[PDB]
Each structure stands twice: as C-alpha cells, then as structure tokens.
Amino acid sequence: IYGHEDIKRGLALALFGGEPKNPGGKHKVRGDINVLLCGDPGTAKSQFLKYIEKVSSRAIFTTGQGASAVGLTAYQRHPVSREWTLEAGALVLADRGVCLIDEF
DNA sequence: ATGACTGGAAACTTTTTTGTACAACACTCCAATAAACAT
Numbered sequence: 001i002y003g004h005e006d007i008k009r010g011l012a013l014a015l016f017g018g019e020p021k022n023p024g025g026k027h028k029v030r031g032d033i034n035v036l037l038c039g040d041p042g043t044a045k046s047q048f049l050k051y052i053e054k055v056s057s058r059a060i061f062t063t064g065q066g067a068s069a070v071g072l073t074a075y076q077r078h079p080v081s082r083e084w085t086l087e088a089g090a091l092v093l094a095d096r097g098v099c100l101i102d103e104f
Numbered sequence: 105a106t107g108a109c110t111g112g113a114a115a116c117t118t119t120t121t122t123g124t125a126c127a128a129c130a131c132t133c134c135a136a137t138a139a140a141c142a143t
Contacts, residue, residue, distance in 0.1 A: 068106080070106080071106095076105090
C-alpha cells in the first residue's frame with residue numbers, strides 16, 4: 001500500500017523497543033516504545049501489522065473476542081490426582097518481542 | 105473452563121405545552137382641500 005509515510009516511520013522505530021534501563025535510584029522505569037494505531041475503517045489498518053510479524057524473529061497475533069482476562073498472562077489446578085500447577089497466557093511467552101493485538 | 109442462557113437494564117427517542125414573538129386590524133385622526141357659499 002502506497003502512501004502514509006508518517007505511519008511507516010513509527011513501525012520501524014517500535015521494532016527496536018529501546019533499551020529498558022534503570023534511570024532512577026530505587027524505581028525501575030520501563031523503557032519500551034508503545035505505539036497505538038487507530039484509523040478510519042477503509043484504509044486497511046491490519047495489513048500494516050502483518051508485515052512486521054514476518055520480518056522479525058518473534059511475534060504473535062490475537063483478537064479481542066478470542067481472549068480475555070484468563071488467556072492474557074496468568075490464570076487453575078490439575079484436577080486429576082490432587083495437584084496444583086499454574087499456567088501462563090500469551091504475553092509471557094512473547095519475551096523480548098513485538099506483540100500484535102487486534103480489535104482492542 | 106468460555107460460552108451459554110434468561111435476568112435485568114441508561115440513555116434518548118418521542119411529544120409538548122409552555123411561555124414568547126410577531127403577524128394582522130379596524131383604526132381615530134388628520135390635514136389639507138376643495139368646492140361652496142358667502143363675499
């Protein structure tokens with residue numbers, strides 16, 4: 001898709017994600033570049049995200065109605081022979097990568 | 105479990121009758137006026 005040069009500039013800078021350091025003395029300040037896109041439905045906004053997930057090394061893709069508070073980061077037991085085992089969602093396995101959330 | 109039911113459910117359309125707002129209207133008056141009836 002040709003056009004929207006200002007949109008393509010923000011996608012390349014967000015791929016690096018910066019360098020999360022510790023600028024304070026006791027507080028851990030996060031250092032990630034978070035970009036929130038929102039356009040008029042009709043200019044194909046989801047096709048701009050399907051390109052960065054193939055040129056990177058780790059990227060996922062989820063929807064809105066396909067997940068909730070359970071399938072997010074952590075949620076119960078193993079009801080087979082009295083056991084307890086915690087699970088994880090989708091943001092934990094996507095370490096040091098670029099996450100793509102559709103229908104927010 | 106999430107995904108399935110009934111169970112309730114907040115803005116939000118409708119009217120609306122309220123005052124106002126401005127429309128006429130018969131309008132008393134007028135202002136010569138004009139002819140007439142004196143000169």
